Amino acid sequence: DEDIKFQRENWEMIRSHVSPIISNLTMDNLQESHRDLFQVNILIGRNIICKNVVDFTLNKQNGRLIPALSALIALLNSDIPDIGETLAKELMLMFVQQFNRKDYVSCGNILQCLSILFLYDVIHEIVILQILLLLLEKNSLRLVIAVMKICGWKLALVSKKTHDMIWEKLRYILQTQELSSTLRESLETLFEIRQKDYKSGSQGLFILDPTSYTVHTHSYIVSDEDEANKELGNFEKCENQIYDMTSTNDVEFKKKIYLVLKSSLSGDEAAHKLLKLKIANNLKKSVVDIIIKSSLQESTFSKFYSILSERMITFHRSWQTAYNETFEQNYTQDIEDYETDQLRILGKFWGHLISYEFLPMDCLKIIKLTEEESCPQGRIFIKFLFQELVNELGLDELQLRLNSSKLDGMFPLEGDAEHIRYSINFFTAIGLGLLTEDMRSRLTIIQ
Amino acid sequence: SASHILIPASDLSWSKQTDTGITHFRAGMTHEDEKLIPTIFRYITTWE
């Protein structure tokens, strides 16, 4: 028969759809898992969707994935109450069976599910407390701790009066009665979490709003025979904006940094006032630009802007990246606009920070001395850079830093003797030629 | 203007001993409404 055929692989594929969704169920996938689960017929695979949750809960590989699982149950119970209705039934029977079997591993797997379902308003507090009464009737104290650690946060909010009475009888256990040792420190740990106010049992996937979850708080008790509907999981036979072309937000902020800059006396004073502002990290690249441009209005270098920038760098590392991004942005892009009177300010400015290790020598590896990849104003900037390196450190201390720099931009050694002839010619034009003794040895071997 | 400036205050008991550096700022001039009035020292290029 082809209708019994066509309904069977329909029953197979629905079974072969839910089982990989449940295995791929995790946080930040819950809504995507629930969307694809909604298009497959949940109502026909009613016990299929329930059994694939119970076994994936029971398997002991999980226990971690239970709050992802119980959040999907709330998504189903919000959509279809009958799905969370039946799935609340089986977990009652799965507890009462394994409590009678004394399967302590399988009991705790179910009780973590029943806890988080109570965290998501799926089940009532009556079904929770009566389980607690059965566990506290015997010892069963390994199980009741993992329940009340997770659900007692919500449970004291809802039904405080009986929940005080659960605590009071549970307190009578430790104090007036003898207990086994390994169990005992876990029970008083619950009293320790009590004074920490349950802040480590109150984290889950509250995706549904309290009015988005249709409130089907199933008020079943664990003293009801719950119909054990295994039979529907078998196979049967259905005969059935304004565009922003201006930057007035930036101009007002650009005014405020400039007013801060001109209202201070010393460099530590302006450094204080900038750090007082708590500038956001997107603007901290732009604040460095405002400092440097206003350092070019001065018409002379000042030690103000150095010790301004030094207190920036030692404060927090995002300032230090902001100068390192700006020094590349100045050399690769901004040299073409700057006059030679502004280059002697910048070459003395960046030469001050490099010579006192606020910027590393590795930032100088970006700068390369060729005929093609050099600007005539770029050669001016390097010349005013190295003089401040020579004046502060000395000629021998600069020799040590350039040897530890291992850069190729100023120092070609591997070949290309037209660049070696270029680099000796450029450095001796600056006035520093003592460092070029490495290149002249390399040059005459090529000849 | 010359006194709308945070004045450095640092530990007069130990400032006579050594150079402490600028560790705290004393307020120079106040008003109910904040204005960051610039000071001339910025506007006069330095001797060195």
Partner: peptide
């Protein structure tokens, strides 16, 4: 707190005596 920094009084100071820690000088 008044950790040896500040003024004996803001009376003859002609200031407010307001003292704030230098965020620049830390290390």
């Amino acid at each position: 707190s008044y950790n040896g920094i500040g003024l004996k009084s803001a009376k003859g100071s002609s200031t407010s005596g307001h003292v704030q820690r230098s965020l620049a000088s830390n290390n």
